Amino acid sequence: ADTAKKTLTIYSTMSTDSERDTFRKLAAAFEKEHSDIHVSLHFPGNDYENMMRVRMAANDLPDLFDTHGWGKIRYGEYTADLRDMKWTQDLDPNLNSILKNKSGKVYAYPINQAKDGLAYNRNILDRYGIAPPETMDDFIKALRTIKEKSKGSIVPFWFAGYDKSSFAQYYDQFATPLLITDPAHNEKKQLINGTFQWSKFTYLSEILKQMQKEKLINIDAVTAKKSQLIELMAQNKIAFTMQGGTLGQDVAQINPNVKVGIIPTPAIHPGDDPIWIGGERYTLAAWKDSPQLKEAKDFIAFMARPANAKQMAEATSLPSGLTNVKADIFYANDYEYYQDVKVEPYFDRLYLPNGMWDVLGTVGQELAADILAPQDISQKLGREYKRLREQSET
């Protein structure tokens, strides 16, 4: 260590080599402009939550940290208000409800943003005359069409069911149109206050069971692995799958003749609009009590400069959080086509106690394996919801 420098500690949930390497390159560029700062960048991976929990309890936070979809709920008491920073004038308005309170606090700087729906093979849908589905009913009808017309040669909706998170993603994304987006058919208040009736969730298990029974998902869903997806998609073997984020670009590298697109998550209730799911992905929040708060803010401002924000966003394959930055990403075409579609945060992060992600994955895998029936799943979910609320409380 150089004792003529002070250390600025930054925690990140970034996972890929492109993300980590680009963040390090930008940290090095920051250091060129600030000869007295050594940036200490940490990527704790699976240990992130445990380490931040202990650091919060110790009142010993990193100077900058990633809130990764939990900005208000988990980090509200520790974050510096960023409302007086210059970059806030360009915050994507789709992020206002997620990264601000109505009373004006800006909780964190969004490096990027997540917008998840369904990924699909454009050519397959054109072969069979299928328009992008905007409702669950139209989605299922498309799956039936693909099964009928392909005579079983194309998987209509593919799951890597070996990994329970594949089913969790299904439940989590579709819980938003089911329970959140429609003012006449939502349960926001009941979810937050513990009175939610899990009988209202059964619909999603019924749909999944319909897809299984009707051979609209892959026959091998219980044993299919994430590592198989790119090759199968590039071989024109899959019509739809839940969005993973880099599928199109990865497939194009192997077979440029296959064009993968994305669409928003279909709506469920009549008259409701399709929705993008995500919002926060990676953020930089400053610890309000950091002795190096000024430097932390200088680093955020540096990251928010358009050339830097574009670079970082592109490494993550997602749009920037700022309107003055147009990251050249693979799905940019589709995000422009769907520019007026709204964004909802991930259901589990806002509406369920911590721990429910794994439970959603569990029950979906047990459904696919014919261990649990839809009615019994909702009862298990309710029990875990109650238990995990009781534990997060006490």
Closest CB to Cl ion among residues 227, 375: 227
Rounded to a whole number of angstroms, the minimum distance from the CB of residue 184 to Cl ion is 31
Rounded to a whole number of angstroms, the minimum distance from the CB of residue 61 to Cl ion is 11
Q: How far apart are CA 347 and CA 173, in angstroms?
A: 7
Closest CB to Cl ion among residues 244, 382: 244
Closest CB to Cl ion among residues 31, 49: 49
Q: Which residue, 286, 319, 356, 317, is CA-closest to 15?
A: 317
Which residues from 300-319 bind Cl ion, rule CB under 5 A?
A: 319
User: How is residue 163 written in tokens?
Assistant: 């990994």
Judged by CB under 5 A, the residue of 44, 244, 306, 382 near Cl ion is: 244
Give yes or no for residue 23 binding Cl ion (CB under 5 A). no
Q: H/E element holding 369? A: none
Of 84-92, 112-120, 210-218, 333-341, the segment contacting Cl ion by CB under 5 A is: 112-120
Closest CB to Cl ion among residues 209, 326: 326
User: How is residue 375 written in tokens?
Assistant: 């009615």
Q: How far apart are CA 119 and CA 137, in angstroms?
A: 17
Residue where the block lists tokens 């994430």: 226
Judged by CB under 5 A, the residue of 37, 118, 296, 327 near Cl ion is: 327
Name beta bridge partners: 41.
Answer: 10
Which residues from 71-100 bind Cl ion, rule CB under 5 A?
A: none
Rounded to a whole number of angstroms, the minimum distance from the CB of residue 27 to Cl ion is 21
Closest CB to Cl ion among residues 11, 299: 11
346-349 LR contacts (CB < 8 Å, sep 24+): 346/69, 346/172, 346/173, 346/277, 346/278, 346/279, 347/172, 347/173, 347/175, 347/176, 347/179, 347/180, 347/277, 348/172, 348/175, 349/69, 349/70, 349/73
Rounded to a whole number of angstroms, the minimum distance from the CB of residue 6 to Cl ion is 25
Size of the site for Cl ion (CB under 5 A): 19
Cα 156 to Cα 133, 143, 330, distances in angstroms: 13, 5, 23
Burial 314-344 (b: 16+ CB within 10 A, else e): bbbbbbbbbeebebebbbeebbeebeebebb
Closest CB to Cl ion among residues 177, 319: 319
Rounded to a whole number of angstroms, the minimum distance from the CB of residue 327 to Cl ion is 4
Give yes or no for residue 24 binding Cl ion (CB under 5 A). no
Give yes or no for residue 243 binding Cl ion (CB under 5 A). yes
Give yes or no for residue 226 binding Cl ion (CB under 5 A). yes
Q: Which residue, 332, 303, 329, is CA-closest to 316?
A: 329
Closest CB to Cl ion among residues 253, 375: 253
Q: Quote the Cα angle for 158-153-268, to 5°.
A: 40
Torsion of Cα atoms, 139 then 168 then 273 then 319, to 10°: -110
C-alpha 36: how far from chain center: 36
Closest CB to Cl ion among residues 329, 367: 329
Coil vs helix vs strand at 318:
coil
Which residues from 156-195 bind Cl ion, rule CB under 5 A?
A: 162-163
Of 46-54, 77-85, 232-240, 286-294, the segment contacting Cl ion by CB under 5 A is: 46-54
Closest CB to Cl ion among residues 98, 325: 325
Give yes or no for residue 119 binding Cl ion (CB under 5 A). yes
Q: How far apart are CA 229 and CA 119, in angstroms?
A: 12
Cα 146 to Cα 51, 124, 141, 152, 312, distances in angstroms: 47, 8, 9, 8, 38
Closest CB to Cl ion among residues 99, 247: 247
Rounded to a whole number of angstroms, the minimum distance from the CB of residue 323 to Cl ion is 8
Q: For the window 344-363, what string marks contact with Cl ion as x by the rule CB under 5 A?
A: -----------x-xx-----
Q: For the window 259-298, what string marks contact with Cl ion as x by the rule CB under 5 A?
A: ----------------------------------------
Judged by CB under 5 A, the residue of 24, 83, 141, 225 near Cl ion is: 225
The residues binding Cl ion (CB under 5 A) are 49, 52, 119, 162-163, 225-226, 243-245, 247, 319-320, 325-327, 355, 357-358
